[PDB]
Subunit: 915 residues, 2 copies
């Protein structure tokens, strides 16, 4: 979904925004423009306030009098905007006129009037937007007025920073913006003293926010360095953010009060107000706050430190003030002055400190101020209660409202995002959500107002106004997710199967119709969690909690697959499982089991709300005992029927049932089964729980899976734990590999294969595919019984070789000389005459022990001594040659295994060369 | 158009005219000529009746017997003309033959016969035309005859005035013009008695008009003074106009009746018949007249008084007689005689009065007359109903006819004009039109006959015959005009879009096809009378009354510019306005608004009949609020948009709309704005509803329109009603004129100029362009603050002149002596030694008060006393010199302002001379 927005109709600029309580029309102040928009943010009307030829330096602007200074077309910035409902108009105060104010008709934006002539008609030279604020207060005729604060820019004589002014009925009337009570001695206005300007050149009061409360008017302000920070002479300017207040009723301006305000977080100071918003707590916050319904609260935003009002720091904190607490601080302060203690202490106003005069008085909240101990400041800075702090992205603006008693706070960010915060000090928690309706790259402005209906929140940017909906629970699809988010507005409208606020849910008041906590969802359980595929139409009981009255009717849907009607009794729902015809359509190809999300479909809504893990487990498919029992599910194996089933009764008879894996029928392993090719040999086997074949059932067979040939040999089952294939010989064609492992399957009654967990195999080995030489065979294990047969020039078992002579040769225990040693090749071909070389000789059929080879090696005449570690038996000899000084030059290498017998000696093919 | 006419073919003369009922051929009697013409007045045939050698004195003319008296070629005047259809000929009775009659064949004018031989064949010596008349009455054979009356000229033995004569079939036959029944005792003729001739020498009966009615024959006659006026002996002759009647059936001539006739108007007597015409009334006149369809009426024309039959008076009146009324008068008279009361009373006929004899009789209308109480006269003159009277131009002739029941009367005038009169006593109204088809200079004759078809009316003049069309409605272009004229013949043929009679309009009988009254036109209205230029294709509803069925189809045409189709529903027409593309093409350059005549174009005719005022008003063009609202049209101004538009919605927003002129934005005046050149001064202004500049809008500036230099100074708008340009100095180059008013324009947001109704200006004044002298400056207003600066010898404000010394001089309140008086010139240069002279001295820098100058003036030593009234301060002194007897002769004039101080005195350039 996209958020409805109004792009800077003048793509060029934007400054202030306000909403009409009745209409919902949105008025937007901007530079050179003032717009009237619909609730939807469609452009209703555009007013051209802009570019006027003018010059800031000139006093009474060009229209009244001629100015020596040159003029230029300049932009007129909307400094302020205030809705005057009674007058049915809009006060849209600009600048660049010496700050002349304009009156636009409410409906059409028709300019009712814009008083320029008198001095009062000029507010301030100041070009900056938002540095001004104020409130319009009205009563029936003969009671009324406008309170406005603005920066001076060092214009102290020309304009008052704070004033109480008149708003006549007729826009044409000359009287406008005149001071409520003007006397030669005192006027309902406060000017900045010239002395204070000389001392600190730049001093100026910037008014951020302002609101009327009870019967007073408050302003959040920023001021300069005056005794803060201390400094003998001018240099750097830092600001102090303070609260100001006035009685509506005080024409005299005696009521003025000014307290510094801020808050600290773990030793970090937040002194500068970015924005504020007066609001109500609602039942939730108020209770724990300890307030009356009527009592007000002030949300604020402050940046860290005293530095750079023009461009503040990212570090920012949202604090809170209860008006009762501030009222107390003020009353406390006044009751003190009346004590006669200390001075008034207001630096910018009164350079010379005047003392407070003691007097008898009943100090109340009603106290409007008196002639003596006149305008006064404040010593103790009022601290606020911190709420949320953003380090990375500075908060710019804030708003708040009461929703179902929970207090939702809105906070603009430098990024163009809005945070939706439930304040739960009085409750318990933090920030619920963040949104970027606005503008992804760059920030939001202080004027952020909720609509009259409070459906949306218009968020203003330099560039655009964006209608950000407050609560937007609809985004949440399921009860689990809805309640999961936690943003307090959202609840699960059970019957509607949607997520929204209490007000939005029809009949939410009724029981279990609306769910606040996850527990209410919905939690569901089914008593028969697991049902077998074979079973049909089984009775199931459903336990559900935190659900509304279902009397409308409910259906059980296992999945999109099926749906069965249910009847309700007690606090349970009774439905039936699907038919066998229906159940397997699902189960097929899922195999072992299929977990399915059984849902409940409500009759009224027609949407599945609640779910549970439901298992369909089909035992019958299992072909063997191991899969049946040993598997993950509850299945029973029937030894006799040789079928796997859920029901015990289905088995042939009681003795036949297999509950445990140990009890199955399986083949136990023994020492490796060695099988020579072409030899008749029996193969004994061990195993457990071998079944006695029943009537109509045949006996046991051994099946060998050899690709070349598969052998079927019948066997005898001696007892429950032993088997034996009958005398037979096996072979494979190829002579490719010596040792071939083969899978064997033991079967009975033709097809029934007994389980083989170990997966024992039979090793068919053929006597030397690998060994052409007598030395290699005798080298091999004595277990094989494989031995060298002289006549054939080959090596096989005695069984395999005919005995013309009494003997075939087997290494009796290594006491068997062999024979025919050969030298393939040797390393270092050449060597020095001096000797010392390490010759590495590699041969095929050498001696088995080192001791015999030692003294055996010779290079020609030269004696060579072999190395023990280096020597790998019958494969390789590493030997070190001795002194070569002899006459030969080149000579062949000789190895005599034990003795240099004629059969026993080997000579190198190529000779070793000495150089 | 010109009227078809026949010029006196004999250019020489003209006398009588008649139309053939079947053919339409027109026969025209004239002197020496008888013409046959076509309906068109083309010459068909000309007959020569003329110049015959003859002599009036001779009895049986030369042909029959020899005459002693000398003959001369004389003209033969056509006395009478009568169409004999049965005989297929024309009786054209002439004169100069002793009145022999001629018979011309109908078609060719071939002379069938002209009986001369017998005495009867001679009608009368009388040369005058028109003094004769008569009727031809015919029946099948063995029933028939001709009745003719003529003047005698004192020929009583020769000819009968009235006779009943025979008209035989054969023109050759001798029998012609023989009396119907001739007896030795009584013949069907009436002669004038010799006795009556001796008594009154000249007595003669002139017969003007004659007609047959029912079964009688009537004649309108003129006679002489016989008992009227009373007179012992002959002297003057006056005439009495009377009516005569006879039964057609009375061979005996017993039926003769004679009533005097006339009519009076407000005590004015109209006794002399000019002409008459028997006719029908038609339904309209008859009804109110109270007559049967068959009943006849007699229109007549009479001149005022009894005098000069030969040349009557201009005063003439058209009267009326209903035949029923005259018949009643006759029956009434007869029933009376039968009573035996009184005498017969017929002066000319019976000199000796014979009494009426009583007798039992049923007196009916049928009564033909009896042997006793034989021809009789009448006592009571029958009065007629007056209709129209012309004082200025005498009526000569008359005709009338029935048209669509309305009775139209035609009246010739002495001028040669015809009047078309609808007689509406029985209806209600008067004279509709007058025409000069005829002959512009001089008159029309009694023979005026309508054509058979009654399309035209042949109007005869001495010189020419003119075919004057009766009804000529075609002249009228629009329904409004057509119905406007009122001449009853005309109606608006809606679909044809023409003006004509009912008979002429095809399908006029159908509903709303023909319009009689203006209301029927057409009256049109459009509901959206005013439509804005900005609007397009607006629905308009059209309300029209008195229109025929439009189902043929109608189009809306705003003007010649565009035309849009329309659909009809109910009694309304729905059309659409033009498109914006179309509408402004019109609007451009007309500005404020353009009224356009939206017409309706009928599908059948294709002519625009009906119209309405349609306004196109484009608001947008208005540049300023004043023009927009303050103007003449409904336009709204949008303060914020600063645009003018018809639609309220288009304005920026509700508060922005300007409906009323007061609400605009305008600059109010203050005391005159005085601005010195080269001085830094602010200029405060007052105004109303100054706008607050909205977004994207700049502030206020003051622009001075000075031709030399235009200054742009920015200003501040304090509130909706006050402004002020900032401290600056202004100047203009030239030093030509002291006070220069300058137009100033206040602008905001660069171009927007605020309205200046008063058109207030700034007066730039420079300290004495006008005043070189100290006296002149101090004289000027204290307001200017302008004063005289001694060191410079010039005059300017203190600001303007450097103070080495503590003072620059200003008249503190006139207590400031100045200085350096000078005398330019004085009048009377010379004077008498005795004195008394009034010296008129004219100078530049004199005293401000009279009191100081008095006693100041001296001519040399001689004391001179000044005159108060005569004295114009510091410009001129009028002074009267005292006695000069001193020795000097000539001396210089001196004026000492208050005191004769050395700085303070002035002496004349030229001296005053005493002689």
């Amino acid at each position: 979904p996209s958020f409805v927005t109004f792009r800077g109709e003048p793509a060029e600029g934007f400054n202030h925004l306000v909403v009409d309580e009745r209409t919902g029309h949105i008025y937007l102040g901007a530079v050179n423009r003032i717009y009237k928009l619909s609730s939807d943010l469609k452009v209703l009307v555009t007013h051209q306030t802009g570019p006027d030829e003018d010059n800031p330096k000139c006093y009474p602007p060009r229209i009244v009098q001629t100015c020596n200074e040159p003029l230029a077309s300049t932009n007129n910035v909307n400094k302020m905007l205030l809705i005057d409902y009674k007058e049915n108009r809009l006060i849209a105060c600009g600048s660049l006129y010496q700050g002349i104010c304009k009156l636009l008709r409410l409906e059409d934006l028709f300019k009712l009037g814009e008083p320029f002539h008198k001095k009062e008609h000029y507010l301030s030279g100041v070009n900056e937007s938002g540095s001004v604020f104020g409130v319009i207060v009205s009563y029936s005729n003969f009671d009324d007025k406008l309170f406005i604060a603005t920066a001076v820019d060092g214009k102290p004589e020309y304009f008052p920073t704070i004033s109480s002014r008149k708003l006549t009925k007729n826009s044409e009337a000359d009287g406008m913006f005149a001071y409520v009570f003007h006397d030669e001695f005192v006027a309902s206005m406060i000017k900045i003293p010239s002395d204070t300007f000389t001392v600190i050149p730049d001093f100026d009061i910037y008014y951020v926010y302002g609101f009327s409360s009870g019967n007073f008017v408050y302003f959040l302000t920023l001021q300069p360095e005056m005794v803060s920070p201390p400094g003998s002479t001018t240099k750097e300017q830092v600001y102090t953010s303070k609260l100001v207040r006035l009685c509506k009723e005080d024409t005299a301006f005696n009521s003025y009060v000014e307290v510094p305000i801020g808050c600290e977080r773990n030793g970090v100071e937040y002194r500068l107000l970015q924005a504020a918003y007066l609001s109500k707590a609602g039942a939730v916050l108020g209770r724990t706050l300890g307030v009356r319904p009527d009592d007000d609260l002030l949300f604020t935003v402050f940046s860290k430190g005293q530095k750079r009002k023009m461009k503040s720091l990212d570090e920012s904190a949202l604090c809170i003030f209860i008006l009762k607490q501030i009222n107390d601080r003020i009353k406390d302060r006044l009751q003190s002055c009346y004590r006669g203690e200390g001075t008034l202490d207001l630096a910018w106003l009164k350079v010379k400190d005047i003392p407070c005069s003691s007097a008898l008085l009943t100090i109340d909240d009603n106290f409007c101020g008196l002639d003596m101990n006149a305008p006064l400041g404040v010593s103790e800075m009022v601290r606020g209660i911190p709420v949320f702090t953003e380090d990375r992205d500075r908060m710019t603006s804030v708003i708040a409202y009461v929703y179902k008693n929970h207090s939702l706070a809105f906070v603009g960010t430098k990024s163009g995002k809005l945070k939706k915060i439930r304040v739960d000090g009085p409750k318990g928690n933090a920030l619920q959500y963040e949104t970027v309706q606005v503008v992804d790259s760059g920030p939001v402005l202080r004027d952020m107002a909720f609509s009259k209906d409070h459906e949306q929140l218009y968020i203003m940017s330099e560039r655009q106004l964006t209608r950000v909906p407050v609560e937007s629970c609809g985004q949440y699809r399921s009860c689990g997710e809805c309640l999961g988010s936690g943003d307090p507005h959202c609840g699960w409208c059970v019957l509607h199967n949607t997520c929204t606020r209490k007000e939005r849910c029809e009949r939410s008041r009724e029981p279990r119709r609306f769910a606040s906590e996850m527990k209410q969802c919905v939690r569901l359980t089914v008593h028969p969690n697991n049902i077998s595929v074979s079973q049909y139409n089984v009775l199931l009981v459903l336990e559900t909690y935190n659900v509304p009255e279902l009397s409308a009717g409910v259906n059980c849907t296992f999945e999109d697959l099926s749906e069965m009607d249910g009847l309700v009794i007690g606090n349970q729902i009774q439905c039936y499982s699907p038919a066998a015809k229906e159940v397997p359509r699902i189960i097929t190809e899922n195999g072992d089991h299929h977990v399915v999300q059984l849902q409940l479909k409500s009759k009224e809504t027609g949407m599945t709300f609640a779910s549970t893990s439901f298992v369909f487990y089909n035992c019958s498919v299992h072909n063997s005992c191991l899969s049946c029992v040993e598997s993950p599910y509850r299945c029973h194996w029937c030894k006799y029927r040789h079928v796997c089933t859920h029901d015990p009764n289905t088995c042939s008879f009681q003795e036949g049932r297999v509950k445990l894996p140990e009890d199955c029928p399986q083949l136990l392993r023994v020492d490796k089964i060695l099988v020579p090719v072409e030899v008749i040999k029996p193969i004994t086997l061990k195993a457990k729980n071998l079944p006695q074949p029943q009537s109509g059932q045949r006996g046991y067979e051994c099946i060998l899976n050899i690709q070349g040939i598969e052998q079927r040999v019948p066997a005898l089952r001696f007892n429950s734990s032993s088997v034996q294939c009958q005398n037979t010989s096996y072979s494979y064609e190829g002579m490719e590999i010596n040792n071939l492992p083969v899978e064997l399957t033991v079967v009975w009654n033709g097809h029934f294969n007994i389980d083989n967990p170990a997966q024992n195999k039979v090793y068919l080995y053929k006597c030397g595919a690998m060994r052409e030489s007598c030395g290699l065979c005798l080298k091999a294990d004595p277990d094989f019984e494989c031995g060298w047969c002289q006549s054939p020039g080959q090596c096989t078992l005695r069984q395999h070789c005919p005995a013309h002579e009494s003997r075939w040769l087997e290494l009796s225990g290594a006491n068997s000389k062999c024979t025919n040693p050969r030298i393939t090749e040797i390393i270092p071909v050449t060597g020095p005459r001096e000797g010392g070389t390490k010759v590495t000789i590699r041969g095929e059929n050498l001696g088995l022990e080192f001791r015999d080879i030692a003294s055996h090696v010779k290079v020609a005449g030269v004696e060579c001594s072999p190395l023990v570690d280096g020597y790998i038996p019958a494969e390789q000899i590493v030997c070190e040659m001795g002194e070569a000084k002899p006459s030969q030059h080149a000579g062949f290498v000789e190895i005599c295994v034990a003795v240099c017998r004629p059969e026993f000696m080997a000579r190198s093919s190529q000779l070793y060369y000495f150089m």
